[PDB]
Amino acid sequence: TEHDQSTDIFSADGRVFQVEYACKAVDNGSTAVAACCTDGVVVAVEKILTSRMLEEGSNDRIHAVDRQAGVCICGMLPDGRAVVSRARAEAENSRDVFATPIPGSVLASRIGEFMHVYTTHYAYRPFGCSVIIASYADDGPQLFVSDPSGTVAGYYGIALGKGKTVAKTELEKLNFKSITCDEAVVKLTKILHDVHDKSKDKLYELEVAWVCNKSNCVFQHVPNDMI
Amino acid sequence: MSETTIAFRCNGFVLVAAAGLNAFYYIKIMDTEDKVTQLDSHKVVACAGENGPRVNFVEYIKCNMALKRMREHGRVIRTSAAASFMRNALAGALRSRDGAYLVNCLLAGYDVAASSDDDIATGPHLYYMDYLGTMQEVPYGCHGYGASFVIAMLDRLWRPDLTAQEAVDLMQKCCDEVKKRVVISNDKFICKAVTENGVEIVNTVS
Amino acid sequence: SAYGLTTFSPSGRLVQIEYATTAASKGTTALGVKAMDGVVIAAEKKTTSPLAASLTVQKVFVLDDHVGCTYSGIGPDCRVLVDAARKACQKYRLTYHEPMPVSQLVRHISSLYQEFTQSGGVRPFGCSLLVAGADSQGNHLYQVDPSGTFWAWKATSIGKGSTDAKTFLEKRYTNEMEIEDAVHTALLTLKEGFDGTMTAENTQVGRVSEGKFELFTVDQLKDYLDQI
Amino acid sequence: SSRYDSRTTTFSPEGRLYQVEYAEEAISQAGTVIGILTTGGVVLGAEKGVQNSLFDSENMEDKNISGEKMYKIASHIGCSVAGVTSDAYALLNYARLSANRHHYTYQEPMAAEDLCRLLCDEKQLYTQYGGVRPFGVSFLLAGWDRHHGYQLYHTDTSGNYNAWRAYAIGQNDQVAQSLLKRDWKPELTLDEGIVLCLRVLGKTMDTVKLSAERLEVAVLHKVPAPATQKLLEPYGVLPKTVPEFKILRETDLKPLIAEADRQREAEEAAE
Amino acid sequence: TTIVGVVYKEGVVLGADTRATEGSIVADKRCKKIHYMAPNIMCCGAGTAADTEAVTNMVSANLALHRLDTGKQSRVHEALTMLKRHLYRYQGHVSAALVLGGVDVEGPFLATVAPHGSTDRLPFVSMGSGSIAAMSALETGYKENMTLEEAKELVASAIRKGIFNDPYSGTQVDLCVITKTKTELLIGYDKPNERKYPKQEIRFPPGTTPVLREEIRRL
Amino acid sequence: FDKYITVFSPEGSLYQVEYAFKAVTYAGLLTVAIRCKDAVLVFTQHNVPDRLMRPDTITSLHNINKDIGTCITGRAPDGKSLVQKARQEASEYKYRYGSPIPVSVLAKRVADMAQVRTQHAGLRLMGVVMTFLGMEQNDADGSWVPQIYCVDPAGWCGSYHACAIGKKQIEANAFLEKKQKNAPFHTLSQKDAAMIALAALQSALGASLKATDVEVGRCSVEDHCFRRVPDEDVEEWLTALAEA
Amino acid sequence: SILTYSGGSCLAMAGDGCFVIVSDNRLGEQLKTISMEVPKLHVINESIVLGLTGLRTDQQTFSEKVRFRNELYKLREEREIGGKAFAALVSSMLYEARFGPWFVEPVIASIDKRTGEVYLCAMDLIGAPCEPEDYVCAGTCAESLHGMCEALWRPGLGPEELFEVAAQAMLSACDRDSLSGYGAVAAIVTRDKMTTRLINGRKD
Amino acid sequence: SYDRAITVFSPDGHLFQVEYAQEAVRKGLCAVGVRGKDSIIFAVEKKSVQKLQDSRTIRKIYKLDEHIYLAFAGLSADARVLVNHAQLECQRFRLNYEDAVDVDLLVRYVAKVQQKSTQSSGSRPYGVSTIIGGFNENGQPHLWKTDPSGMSSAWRAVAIGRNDKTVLEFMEKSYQENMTRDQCVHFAIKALLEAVESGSKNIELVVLENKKALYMGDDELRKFVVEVEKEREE
């Protein structure tokens, strides 16, 4: 069992255990959900509070990375913040060098590449976060997830963290072709209130954001009255 | 060329002389600087140029020769090997960033057997060098504005079998002709002999 | 990583160099024979399956117009030595405007093997080479091993079937063979150790003669196989 | 990755450097090598391995630069090695480069003890800095210089060197060192030295007759100086004799092997 | 120097004169100015001799490495790209002008490369100090789909205009023919400047020169 | 110790290289490539387990340039890192020599990237097989010929008439060997080649395939470019197989 | 001019199985003469002689570098270098200093021991070679030398006749030059032997 | 570039790499220095007498400058590297300040090189202890010792290497101030023969006086040993 001490070693079965362990940190974190409508994309996440004395906005998990795109972090927040910085730099590079807003599919593939490189070298460890990427540039609305292995995929709806098995069940009873961004906020918030476990985590709040036609394809937090 | 240096070898010695002058434009600061520097027990170098380059060049050669001595059981190095090292330092500097050392030298030595295994021909040697790194063994040689007058005299009067007394006389005639014909004042000379017994000052020449 | 992977052991052995030499001695069989007017080298190229294209598999390489090589052991390791050798030959022509002698090329290769037995962070190469070529001093055949040691030979073999091949060559070798009798002898020696039927498609052959090194094509090799 | 570092340059608990000791054990397993100081030169002799019939010559144009065991470093310095052969080639190139740079800078030959000291400093460096194994080589060096005449040095895997009138490294070095301690004398000639070398190799190999195909012999001696072109070099001065390193062939050894077999048959008679 | 090339029906013909000068003196009356690049590719050079020599040797060696790696015949466009990239990096300080010609699987190819690194692919070119005179024969004589014999006569006539009218060109014509299958070099294809008056022989009797000293050495 | 870094074991082997090959099967998918008279085709399983995933974002096929395609088999993000390095290589080649890189040359360059990690300590091997597809030109007549080249984690590089890679590759190769005995694959039409590749997938998976379960790539003499084949063209090859 | 500062000239000629190579003896600083005993020839091995002209510090530096490379060649290759490979080596060392050159102009003569073929080369200061079959010349009286050889040389001379022609060419050219003279030295090389002679000239 | 940490603290404040270096020093041959009125003696044990050794022995007392000498104990190859550094520093000092270097200042430079080897990543300590002695430009003698940690101190007499602690107890009793050149040579030979077996060719010796240095010959040394062997019987 020396094979699980660094990310630069395969096990006999063809696995990389340090990356699996990093994934377990995401699976024990707070729940997130997201949905891709015909207008846009909506993201929502549960924040577990550690004190009743925090200001509002503390330890935000959702961050803008360009005018038209945003990221939500699951698992370890300071690791997520390092990925947010990288993503900001790739979006700026696309505007400065190629004179375009970065397409959603390209942004997700660069984030994946960046995360993968920390699974290859004896001197670094894998990130302990999964990132939800939400974008609306010239390729339409797009929602992607990148995990600690650096694997990247596109979704119509998705859930992450410790409530994900149940939350997935409830996202399967939505109609993705038809739904608008105002309905979505009500349904997504409901799923998150229902999976919350009241024994373990006593204090919590919800954080919600979107990018859609209503907002002029600007990625932003929803106004706190719509919850 | 404001300072003249002269040297010549005969059968058991080399004589070396150089002018004492230090100047600042047209003002004589002093006229007794010794520019015939001793490098080891049986070797001297006479250099012409500004004080800064002259002193920094001879201290660099002296240091490397002392280092080489102690990584060699304290044995006297041959004159041709010292000449070869100096030439290589002058030529090196010419193609370096700081530029050439503006000095012109005459190197003189008397080679002596290291041990009983040594099959070196013992004798006096004299090498002319210039600031570019040119190096030639010669029987006599000079630098400075006075050089051309003295060289012609030596072409006329030098022989290999001069005695020590005839040679000291001949060096005094050479120095007097520099004073007679060169506008730049070279009023005092310092002279040294290199022999099988080492390096000594010749006091009767000035 | 910048520490050494090859180290001495209590009886004075360097075991990673032995283990690399064991990997070389489990490769497929190659051999070489020096005649009085040239040199031949040959090697087995059996594929694992008939879904593999035979033509593209290379066991014999041109290093320059006068010299070539073959190998046994780990193929991807051999490619690194073949690229370094090609480069050295061209660098020698740029400086002296003549072909690099085989003695000098072998020494260049040998010093690249020696670095991977001492530098930090690397294991040794797991292949032996046979090098054959022509220069002003004549025709030459050399062997180089993972230690970096090299030897000049009249005939020899490397790889799995290498002991039986060397016993067979010791009997049949003479100092007065012509080049064409050497090609015959080389192909006969391979056939002894070969598991299955030797064809012009599953074997490869190269030759030094008249100061040039050349791979046989499949067609040329078929003519020689129909005579043996 | 740091948990797999073997720590080659780390002291161990009695001030020992284990990699240096283990490399010394490798030397003691190699072919025997002998050196002898005479009044006419230095002799170096080595046992070659068993001689297969399929071995070939490199067919080099000049024959006195390298054999199997003996290498020229400069016109006045030669050597013989025991240990890891490819490591010896790396240090031999370093020595060749050092000795010829000195001649470039001073236009005279490098002293023998100086070349030996540079070589040993290159070995010491790998025992103190840089995390890799040391060289596994021992050299006998033969030289001539104007300071001390003929010299014979030995170098070891720690980077230490010493001077000798006769010495042996490799396989049977306690047996060889005992026979030399008996039969060496201050008044040996070059030919008497070569015979004394063949008899010592004879004994350690353990064959009654000396195979001329299983030995190698080199000498460092002084020969008449060649041309003296005073037209092209008007101030060039050569001496009467210059050092030369020579590798003896099978037509120079034939008479000297005879003399070594007769002295072997008259030492088996008294017993 | 005068150097010339044309494309014909099945190939390329390159030509050059053979004089080298320093100042107003003729240093070499038979300098070779047609250099080997590959079995199917040749180059003529004008400019600084050392620069021209160095560049063509370097690219010829890198093309040989690339044939061993890939296993395929060298393409004339590759040679052209490699020359151009080297010349551009040195901003004209490496002063080589070149005419490159050869034949590969896409047919005949002829181009020039200027010292600053610009190129031009054309069906007839000239470079060097005789280039204007030679180009006057090319524009009057060139046509589409020349035979091999027409093309050799046209290149030789262009080089002779340089030889007779430009002071820096002279002596004789060298040609090089490059086809799909072979490359043929024809040194001294035309020699229109023989001796008119035979060289008077000036005999010095042995012992004429005074000698002071002598050394001998056997080898 | 030999189990954890790239050094030799006593039998002459490299264990991190063996284990990187188990990573290829662990991923659980199967790929098959085949070359016929005028084209080369590649068929890979399209797995979208999760009903909420957007299928057109999950692919194992990628263009390296206009004229060369790859298929990744094994650890997916490892394979995407090699796609980016191959893209960079093909673009350096074009700058230096002024022409697009040939598919045999590119495969060799990627094979050298792999060999470097088997011989230097501290970077993990990539647990993938990369298959490269493209047309290459002959110097004799100037005609174009399709090629398949595979590159494995040891740095081996090789060309094939047809190949299966991934889970149950042993059973799918056996199957193609049988079919080869009837007619060499270089005589076959696209349709006949396709029926052999789809039959091998089905036989080895032990299931039935719809067009949405496979993604297919192609280069041809007619159109050099590497392109995805439309679902309708695949349906008609499966239909044609179900009959016979 | 930097190439004419130090003085000196060199010539080489080819014959039937032989060559002759000749230099002057002067060393100066522009019009001042330092020494009258400085020949400019260097024997590389039995088959090859190098003549170097140009600035004297670069003649001494460049010839030492060439002798150092030649010593390492012999230990690596275990053979003497031949004339064509030696000139290629020298050209490569000059081009390495393309943009800050050595101020020297080499003349090289050699004879292939086996065949008896003679090889001559002259180079400019950045390494461009010229390899005629008759003669090569360089130095301060190059223009005059070049014309004397064109008039006196003819094909197929033996050692002694070829010597006479080369000496007369060198002495006539030096008499029209202020910066070269004080006699000459010559080497005569065949397959079998190498002779050297000192030629008497004027003293001005 | 290897940059591993080699010399580290362990749980009771020990630096093991430095103590192991100090063990290599105690295994080494014995060396002794003695300061007199106007002389300094250095005496060293030699490996052994052999028939085959070359008469011209390799020197194990080194000259650093005209007026400074060094003896050592421990690993001979590490000591040669330290000697080389100190020779360069003596010449660097003349180049920068014109004067000849003082002995105490050269000892500080050497001690600082040893100390750095105990704290630099990627390298082990020197396994060497040194004795350094000389005269300033005003005729006053100095004698110093350094250890592998970089600690330096001045002594009137001192010993290092094997049986250092025995030779040091002998010297503590018998040492007297202001001894003569010959009385010092006697005292040093005597101290060495507490550790060493015979006194034939297993001693080398250097006598350093203001402006003169001497590697003692075999004949003058034999005289001094018999005189000492006679007094050890009493």
Automatic annotation (TrEMBL), chain C:
Subcellular location: Cytoplasm; Nucleus
GO BP annotations, alphabetical order: ubiquitin-dependent protein catabolic process
Keywords: Cytoplasm, Nucleus, Proteasome
Entries under Pfam families matching the protein: Proteasome, Proteasome_A_N
Cellular component per GO, a single term: nucleus
Gene3D superfamilies, per the entry: Glutamine Phosphoribosylpyrophosphate, subunit 1, domain 1
Proteasome alpha-type subunits domain sequence ranges: 1-23
Family recorded in the similarity comment: Belongs to the peptidase T1A family.
NCBIfam families: PRK03996.1
Protein's job: The proteasome is a multicatalytic proteinase complex which is characterized by its ability to cleave peptides with Arg, Phe, Tyr, Leu, and Glu adjacent to the leaving group at neutral or slightly basic pH.
Subunit details: The 20S proteasome core is composed of 28 subunits that are arranged in four stacked rings, resulting in a barrel-shaped structure. The two end rings are each formed by seven alpha subunits, and the two central rings are each formed by seven beta subunits.
Protein name per the record: Proteasome subunit alpha type
Species for this entry: Trypanosoma cruzi
From TrEMBL, chain D:
Keyword Secreted: no
InterPro entries the record matches: Ntn_hydrolases_N (IPR029055), Proteasome_alpha (IPR050115), Proteasome_alpha-type (IPR023332), Proteasome_asu_N (IPR000426), Proteasome_sua/b (IPR001353)
Segments forming domain Proteasome alpha-type subunits: 4-26
GO-annotated cellular components: cytoplasm; nucleus; proteasome core complex, alpha-subunit complex
Family: Belongs to the peptidase T1A family.
Function description: The proteasome is a multicatalytic proteinase complex which is characterized by its ability to cleave peptides with Arg, Phe, Tyr, Leu, and Glu adjacent to the leaving group at neutral or slightly basic pH.
Summary of subunit composition and partner proteins: The 20S proteasome core is composed of 28 subunits that are arranged in four stacked rings, resulting in a barrel-shaped structure. The two end rings are each formed by seven alpha subunits, and the two central rings are each formed by seven beta subunits.
Record protein name field: Proteasome subunit alpha type
Organism in which the protein naturally occurs: Trypanosoma cruzi
Automatic annotation (TrEMBL), chain G:
CDD domains, alphabetized: proteasome_beta_type_3
Superkingdom to which the source organism belongs: Eukaryota
Coiled coil: none
Keyword Kinase recorded: no
Pfam families: Proteasome
Annotated GO biological process: proteasome-mediated ubiquitin-dependent protein catabolic process
Subcellular location: Nucleus
Alphabetical keyword list: Cytoplasm, Nucleus, Proteasome
Name assigned to this protein: Putative proteasome beta 3 subunit
TrEMBL record, chain H:
Subcellular location: Cytoplasm; Nucleus
Keyword tags: Cytoplasm, Nucleus, Proteasome
Any one Gene Ontology cellular component term annotated for this protein: cytoplasm
Superkingdom classification of source: Eukaryota
One annotated GO biological process: ubiquitin-dependent protein catabolic process
Similarity annotation: Belongs to the peptidase T1A family.
Record carries keyword Nucleus: yes
Subunit structure: The 20S proteasome core is composed of 28 subunits that are arranged in four stacked rings, resulting in a barrel-shaped structure. The two end rings are each formed by seven alpha subunits, and the two central rings are each formed by seven beta subunits.
InterPro entries in the cross-refs: Ntn_hydrolases_N (IPR029055), Proteasome_alpha (IPR050115), Proteasome_alpha-type (IPR023332), Proteasome_asu_N (IPR000426), Proteasome_sua/b (IPR001353)
Residue ranges the record marks as coiled coil: none
Matching PANTHER family: PROTEASOME SUBUNIT ALPHA/BETA (PTHR11599)
Principal localisation: cytoplasm
Protein name per its UniProtKB record: Proteasome subunit alpha type
Domain Proteasome alpha-type subunits: 2-24
Functional summary from the UniProt entry: The proteasome is a multicatalytic proteinase complex which is characterized by its ability to cleave peptides with Arg, Phe, Tyr, Leu, and Glu adjacent to the leaving group at neutral or slightly basic pH.
Keyword Nucleus on entry: yes
